[PDB]
Design an enzyme around this catalytic site. Structure first.
Site, PDB file in Angstrom:
ATOM      1  N   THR A  60      31.750  26.209  33.249  1.00 23.65           N
ATOM      2  CA  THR A  60      32.560  26.211  34.430  1.00 23.65           C
ATOM      3  C   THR A  60      31.727  26.405  35.670  1.00 23.65           C
ATOM      4  O   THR A  60      32.096  25.909  36.747  1.00 23.65           O
ATOM      5  CB  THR A  60      33.634  27.281  34.378  1.00 23.65           C
ATOM      6  OG1 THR A  60      33.080  28.535  33.995  1.00 23.65           O
ATOM      7  CG2 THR A  60      34.736  26.877  33.414  1.00 23.65           C
ATOM      8  N   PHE A  68      39.544  32.692  38.879  1.00 26.54           N
ATOM      9  CA  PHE A  68      38.913  33.601  37.890  1.00 26.54           C
ATOM     10  C   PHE A  68      39.981  34.396  37.124  1.00 26.54           C
ATOM     11  O   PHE A  68      39.663  35.430  36.507  1.00 26.54           O
ATOM     12  CB  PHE A  68      37.893  34.539  38.600  1.00 26.54           C
ATOM     13  CG  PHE A  68      36.741  33.814  39.163  1.00 26.54           C
ATOM     14  CD1 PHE A  68      35.775  33.290  38.366  1.00 26.54           C
ATOM     15  CD2 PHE A  68      36.651  33.604  40.529  1.00 26.54           C
ATOM     16  CE1 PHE A  68      34.723  32.535  38.888  1.00 26.54           C
ATOM     17  CE2 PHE A  68      35.591  32.855  41.074  1.00 26.54           C
ATOM     18  CZ  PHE A  68      34.636  32.328  40.256  1.00 26.54           C
ATOM     19  N   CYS A 104      38.131  37.009  34.852  1.00 25.24           N
ATOM     20  CA  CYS A 104      36.765  36.628  34.508  1.00 25.24           C
ATOM     21  C   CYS A 104      35.808  37.838  34.611  1.00 25.24           C
ATOM     22  O   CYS A 104      35.653  38.413  35.722  1.00 25.24           O
ATOM     23  CB  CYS A 104      36.252  35.519  35.461  1.00 25.24           C
ATOM     24  SG  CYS A 104      34.660  34.930  34.951  1.00 25.24           S
TER      25      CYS A 104
HETATM   26  C1  HEM Z   1      33.105  29.305  38.251  1.00 23.15           C
HETATM   27  C2  HEM Z   1      32.794  29.801  37.047  1.00 23.15           C
HETATM   28  C3  HEM Z   1      33.919  30.462  36.262  1.00 23.15           C
HETATM   29  C4  HEM Z   1      35.240  30.189  36.222  1.00 23.15           C
HETATM   30  C5  HEM Z   1      35.986  29.237  37.149  1.00 23.15           C
HETATM   31  C6  HEM Z   1      35.801  31.067  35.216  1.00 23.15           C
HETATM   32  C7  HEM Z   1      37.136  31.232  34.905  1.00 23.15           C
HETATM   33  C8  HEM Z   1      37.712  32.155  34.053  1.00 23.15           C
HETATM   34  C9  HEM Z   1      39.157  32.331  33.865  1.00 23.15           C
HETATM   35  C10 HEM Z   1      40.198  31.473  34.592  1.00 23.15           C
HETATM   36  C11 HEM Z   1      39.337  33.303  32.982  1.00 23.15           C
HETATM   37  C12 HEM Z   1      40.642  33.929  32.485  1.00 23.15           C
HETATM   38  C13 HEM Z   1      41.061  33.117  31.263  1.00 23.15           C
HETATM   39  C14 HEM Z   1      42.468  33.445  30.768  1.00 23.15           C
HETATM   40  O1  HEM Z   1      43.227  34.148  31.493  1.00 23.15           O
HETATM   41  O2  HEM Z   1      42.793  32.865  29.649  1.00 23.15           O
HETATM   42  C15 HEM Z   1      38.025  33.750  32.584  1.00 23.15           C
HETATM   43  C16 HEM Z   1      37.728  34.724  31.700  1.00 23.15           C
HETATM   44  C17 HEM Z   1      36.458  34.989  31.221  1.00 23.15           C
HETATM   45  N1  HEM Z   1      35.253  34.592  31.708  1.00 23.15           N
HETATM   46 FE1  HEM Z   1      34.997  33.330  33.300  1.00 23.15          FE
HETATM   47  N2  HEM Z   1      34.782  31.833  34.677  1.00 23.15           N
HETATM   48  C18 HEM Z   1      33.596  31.403  35.239  1.00 23.15           C
HETATM   49  C19 HEM Z   1      32.333  31.905  34.939  1.00 23.15           C
HETATM   50  C20 HEM Z   1      32.026  32.781  33.889  1.00 23.15           C
HETATM   51  C21 HEM Z   1      30.718  33.348  33.564  1.00 23.15           C
HETATM   52  C22 HEM Z   1      29.416  32.977  34.264  1.00 23.15           C
HETATM   53  C23 HEM Z   1      30.880  34.131  32.507  1.00 23.15           C
HETATM   54  C24 HEM Z   1      29.827  34.901  31.777  1.00 23.15           C
HETATM   55  C25 HEM Z   1      28.713  35.387  32.365  1.00 23.15           C
HETATM   56  C26 HEM Z   1      32.295  34.085  32.138  1.00 23.15           C
HETATM   57  C27 HEM Z   1      32.888  34.786  31.137  1.00 23.15           C
HETATM   58  C28 HEM Z   1      34.237  35.002  30.913  1.00 23.15           C
HETATM   59  C29 HEM Z   1      34.737  35.903  29.937  1.00 23.15           C
HETATM   60  C30 HEM Z   1      33.941  36.564  28.786  1.00 23.15           C
HETATM   61  C31 HEM Z   1      36.234  35.851  30.101  1.00 23.15           C
HETATM   62  C32 HEM Z   1      37.301  36.608  29.281  1.00 23.15           C
HETATM   63  C33 HEM Z   1      37.340  38.035  29.955  1.00 23.15           C
HETATM   64  C34 HEM Z   1      38.317  38.968  29.218  1.00 23.15           C
HETATM   65  O3  HEM Z   1      39.493  38.547  28.925  1.00 23.15           O
HETATM   66  O4  HEM Z   1      37.922  40.104  28.865  1.00 23.15           O
HETATM   67  N3  HEM Z   1      32.952  33.370  33.120  1.00 23.15           N
HETATM   68  N4  HEM Z   1      37.081  33.045  33.238  1.00 23.15           N
HETATM   69  C1  LIG Z   2      47.957  21.662  27.901  1.00 19.91           C
HETATM   70  O1  LIG Z   2      47.081  22.789  27.594  1.00 19.91           O
HETATM   71  C2  LIG Z   2      45.893  23.053  28.297  1.00 19.91           C
HETATM   72  C3  LIG Z   2      45.218  21.982  28.838  1.00 19.91           C
HETATM   73  C4  LIG Z   2      44.035  22.180  29.534  1.00 19.91           C
HETATM   74  C5  LIG Z   2      43.477  23.430  29.685  1.00 19.91           C
HETATM   75  N1  LIG Z   2      42.338  23.882  30.313  1.00 19.91           N
HETATM   76  C6  LIG Z   2      42.337  25.197  30.174  1.00 19.91           C
HETATM   77  S1  LIG Z   2      41.061  26.122  30.832  1.00 19.91           S
HETATM   78  C7  LIG Z   2      40.670  27.062  29.455  1.00 19.91           C
HETATM   79  C8  LIG Z   2      39.356  27.791  29.668  1.00 19.91           C
HETATM   80  N2  LIG Z   2      39.323  28.697  30.682  1.00 19.91           N
HETATM   81  C9  LIG Z   2      38.229  29.421  31.040  1.00 19.91           C
HETATM   82  C10 LIG Z   2      37.010  29.328  30.341  1.00 19.91           C
HETATM   83  C11 LIG Z   2      35.808  30.183  30.743  1.00 19.91           C
HETATM   84  C12 LIG Z   2      36.913  28.399  29.183  1.00 19.91           C
HETATM   85  O2  LIG Z   2      35.710  28.346  28.520  1.00 19.91           O
HETATM   86  C13 LIG Z   2      35.177  27.068  28.117  1.00 19.91           C
HETATM   87  C14 LIG Z   2      38.133  27.600  28.822  1.00 19.91           C
HETATM   88  C15 LIG Z   2      38.142  26.646  27.651  1.00 19.91           C
HETATM   89  N3  LIG Z   2      43.397  25.658  29.441  1.00 19.91           N
HETATM   90  C16 LIG Z   2      44.184  24.597  29.122  1.00 19.91           C
HETATM   91  C17 LIG Z   2      45.387  24.355  28.424  1.00 19.91           C
END
Ligand code: HEM
Ligand SMILES: COc1ccc2nc(SCc3ncc(C)c(OC)c3C)[nH]c2c1
Length: 450
Positions: free
Chosen positions: A263, A388, A395
């Site tokens: 990402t 995030f 995140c």
């Molecule tokens: C622009 C870059 C990034 C974007 C847009 C992004 C986005 C996100 C989002 C949307 C979630 C929440 C997912 C959910 O609610 O299902 C998430 C969780 C997470 N991200 Fe990122 N992320 C980025 C970079 C990174 C980086 C650099 C790391 C590691 C160094 C990382 C590690 C994780 C982890 C481990 C989670 C799960 C956290 C938890 O639930 O405890 N992300 N991220």
């Molecule tokens: C229709 O169902 C969908 C479709 C696209 C989607 N894209 C997403 S975004 C899901 C996502 N978010 C954050 C991280 C860091 C990540 O790690 C590779 C992933 C797979 N969820 C979806 C669910």
């Protein structure tokens, strides 16, 4: 109120709407058509897609909704396990890993990753300095080289050496294949049709390539630091007093290798895209880079000085948040927006790019690329800008991604002039995550020593 629903296909309900290579973009078009909320049904399954800050602020109330594993995330747990990303909040391994690994993203930790980020960023600037006249740059390809190497090195003291490779690294090839398959699975009416026997076989072999690399990182460390891996193998959770066991650590490593780069690669690619398409914004960002980054390699405090570059990145995340959806479930029966009753367990999807286009929040010009929107981030209402994610499940790596992106984009802008020589037409590839496909530029060196 009864909620809108897109077109249906008899007994398949809405499932065939996901039979497309770009399902998030399709959902976005449905949102524009139907508005702030719609129901999406498949055989045996329902979810509700939210697009307005008005509803999403309520979805973000952690006393009423918790993180859900969407179908997408349930398929990715096949290799992410009960790592931080695909663990339920109530699974013991979630809070334990959260508590053990949060200290790896403290300010001191961030300061201590700086030098290694610079190492990889210097490798990217050098590759480009060393191209011949009229050669071009495959942007998302090079951004992936940089981001994968950066998490490999900063997180694990492991060198993927992606800039020494002409094709993508094997780990990236199997990652992309695995994400593609998870995405394609979303539309499958009969996932156990034996027609998908080969799909499953390729899936396991890709899971194997990724796990073989995990095994090497673990072996290297046993054979050799103060990084993410040190905390995985050594930290104790202050609550339970326990460290992570071996199985969970392996899931953490794969989780951080993927979430830790894909990402961020996307964000840098979209940010370069928007800069070349907005020459006045490019010049204003380039001016800041020159002004701020006076030394041969950037310092930590200098990266923190790059305000406008920061603004550029947040604006790229506003238009094209690279993890474009997250999912929530109703902890108890509840009413959304005074009009949409939900039962306990009902699922919601937050469609982040549509949230980011809510004209009630952002004004009428939501398709324009204007980093100035972010000049005072305080001004933005709660739950209006969520690239995030939300709350305790937000995140973990947010500061790491932003520091890296800001450092890298700052260096690119100091060191080169860019040309959109093909007049590139945006084409957004979906692998659950989002990234420009085929985006190319040329970079003319400004010959500033490094
Ligand atoms: C622009 C870059 C990034 C974007 C847009 C992004 C986005 C996100 C989002 C949307 C979630 C929440 C997912 C959910 O609610 O299902 C998430 C969780 C997470 N991200 Fe990122 N992320 C980025 C970079 C990174 C980086 C650099 C790391 C590691 C160094 C990382 C590690 C994780 C982890 C481990 C989670 C799960 C956290 C938890 O639930 O405890 N992300 N991220
Ligand atoms: C229709 O169902 C969908 C479709 C696209 C989607 N894209 C997403 S975004 C899901 C996502 N978010 C954050 C991280 C860091 C990540 O790690 C590779 C992933 C797979 N969820 C979806 C669910």
């Amino acid at each position: 109120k009864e909620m809108p629903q897109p077109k249906t296909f008899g007994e398949l309900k809405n499932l065939p709407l996901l039979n497309t290579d770009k399902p998030v973009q399709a959902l976005m078009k449905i949102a524009d058509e139907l508005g702030e909320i719609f129901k999406f049904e498949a055989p045996g399954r329902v979810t509700r897609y939210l697009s307005s800050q008005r509803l999403i602020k309520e979805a973000c109330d952690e006393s009423r909704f918790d993180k859900n594993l969407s179908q997408a995330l349930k398929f990715v747990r096949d290799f992410f396990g009960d790592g931080l990303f695909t663990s339920w909040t109530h699974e013991k391994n979630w809070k334990k890993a959260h508590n053990i690994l949060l200290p790896s993203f403290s300010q001191q930790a961030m300061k201590g990753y700086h030098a290694m980020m610079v190492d990889i960023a210097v490798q990217l600037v050098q590759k480009w300095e060393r191209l011949n006249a009229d050669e071009h740059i495959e942007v998302p390809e090079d951004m992936t080289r940089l981001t994968l190497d950066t998490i490999g090195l900063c997180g694990f003291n492991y060198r993927f050496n992606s800039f020494y490779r002409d094709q993508p690294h094997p780990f990236i090839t199997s990652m992309v294949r695995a994400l593609d398959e998870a995405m394609n699975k979303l539309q499958r009416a009969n996932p156990d049709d034996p027609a998908y026997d080969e799909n499953k076989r390729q899936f396991q072999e890709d899971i194997k390539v990724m796990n073989d690399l995990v095994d090497k990182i673990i072996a290297d460390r046993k054979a050799s630091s103060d990084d993410l891996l040190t905390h995985m193998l050594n930290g104790k959770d202050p609550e339970t007093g326990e460290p992570l066991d071996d199985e969970n650590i392996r899931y953490q490593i794969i989780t951080f290798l993927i979430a830790g780069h894909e990402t961020t690669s996307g964000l840098l690619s979209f940010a370069l895209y928007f800069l070349v398409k907005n020459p006045h914004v490019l010049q204003k960002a380039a001016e800041e880079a020159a002004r701020v980054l006076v030394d041969p390699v950037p310092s930590y405090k200098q990266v923190k000085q790059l305000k406008y570059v920061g603004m550029v990145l947040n604006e790229a995340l506003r238009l094209w948040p690279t993890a474009p959806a997250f999912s929530l479930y109703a902890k108890e029966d509840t009413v959304l927006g005074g009009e949409y009753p939900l039962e306990k367990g009902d699922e919601l999807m937050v469609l982040i790019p549509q949230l980011h286009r809510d004209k009630t929040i952002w004004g009428d010009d939501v398709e324009e690329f204007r980093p100035e929107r972010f000049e005072n981030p305080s001004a933005i209402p709660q739950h209006a800008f969520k690239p995030f994610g939300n709350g305790q499940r937000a995140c973990i790596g947010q500061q790491f991604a932003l520091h890296e992106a800001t450092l890298v984009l700052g260096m690119m802008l100091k060191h080169f002039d860019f040309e959109d020589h093909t007049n590139y037409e945006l084409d957004i590839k979906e692998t659950l995550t989002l990234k420009p496909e085929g985006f190319v530029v040329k970079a003319k060196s400004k010959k500033i020593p490094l």
